[PDB]
Amino acid sequence: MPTLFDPIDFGPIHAKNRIVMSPLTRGRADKEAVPTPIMAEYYAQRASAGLIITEATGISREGLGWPFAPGIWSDAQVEAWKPIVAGVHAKGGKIVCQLWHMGRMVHSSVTGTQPVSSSATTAPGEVHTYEGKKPFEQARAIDAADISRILNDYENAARNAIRAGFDGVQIHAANGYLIDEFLRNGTNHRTDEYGGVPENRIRFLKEVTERVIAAIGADRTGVRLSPNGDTQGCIDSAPETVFVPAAKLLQDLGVAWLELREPGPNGTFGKTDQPKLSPQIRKVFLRPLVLNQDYTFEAAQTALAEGKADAIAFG
Ligand SMILES: [Hg+2]
């Protein structure tokens, strides 16, 4: 029965309503990925929304390949977010920081290093750089040390989020970035614990999630997933083999909520779940499920009313 105007809770986060502002990568931060004063206003305007998820924010330079994106590994960065975050709260808002490791979707001319991924692969297309576009470089496959470091940067990133004042964190595990790369058999060829069976493709996610929930609480922790990707075109043959278990695990670990990004209804009047994911995921994940599609309001108001999701994302 709920509507977009009804309250909802994300763990301890008492969201005023069921709208989620989840911005695309504005890209207006400085070259050291420190937020800037414009960003205060950009975020403060969106305070009316039940909850705000930030633009995806780097946990590490290695993982941040997008020019002028912000991050949150540094003390400087934390200090910059602070006023931005407090701006939002002043206006009675809620806001949660989105944790990005781009994986293989970066260029070493920006990260200063070779792209890292679950396995040594090369993404298709070109990549943006402060010098304009370029051929993707092959990646190198993460090893145990790397993993331990990456895991470090995620935990630090979350902790730093809470230091700046975020009401929580969302682990970005979606859109063919680093965690996604591990989950997909096509991007993951490892023969260690982290590869092979579905249960192993899942391990990397588990381990990231575990650190984070250990660090600030499963009740302040969300994950974003995107089985058919972030874009018109793709359709995962059998998303129940990995993604459902993924979700089941997230339930069990205590995770507060789950955004599920899915390239948006194809007509105007075209269907909401087309790919009928939510019912599969609802089967195993019982807390709030956010659907993020590129959505007209009427469309949103629908899904929510049709039971498909508990709140809806826009940007
Ligand atoms: Hg994205």
TrEMBL record:
Keywords: Flavoprotein, FMN, Nucleotide-binding, Oxidoreductase. GO terms for cellular component: cytosol. The lineage of its organism: Bacteria, Pseudomonadati, Pseudomonadota, Alphaproteobacteria, Acetobacterales. FMN binds at S22, P23, T25, A56, Q98, R224, N292, D294, G315. GO terms for molecular function: FMN binding; oxidoreductase activity, acting on the CH-CH group of donors, NAD or NADP as acceptor. InterPro entries: Aldolase_TIM, OxRdtase_FMN_N, Oye-like. Its cofactor is FMN. SUPFAM superfamilies: FMN-linked oxidoreductases. This is Alkene reductase. It comes from the Bacteria. Residues 4-315 form the NADH:flavin oxidoreductase/NADH oxidase N-terminal domain. PANTHER family: NADH OXIDOREDUCTASE-RELATED, NADPH DEHYDROGENASE 2-RELATED. Transmembrane segments: none annotated. It comes from Gluconobacter oxydans. The keyword Flavoprotein applies. Belongs to the NADH:flavin oxidoreductase/NADH oxidase family.
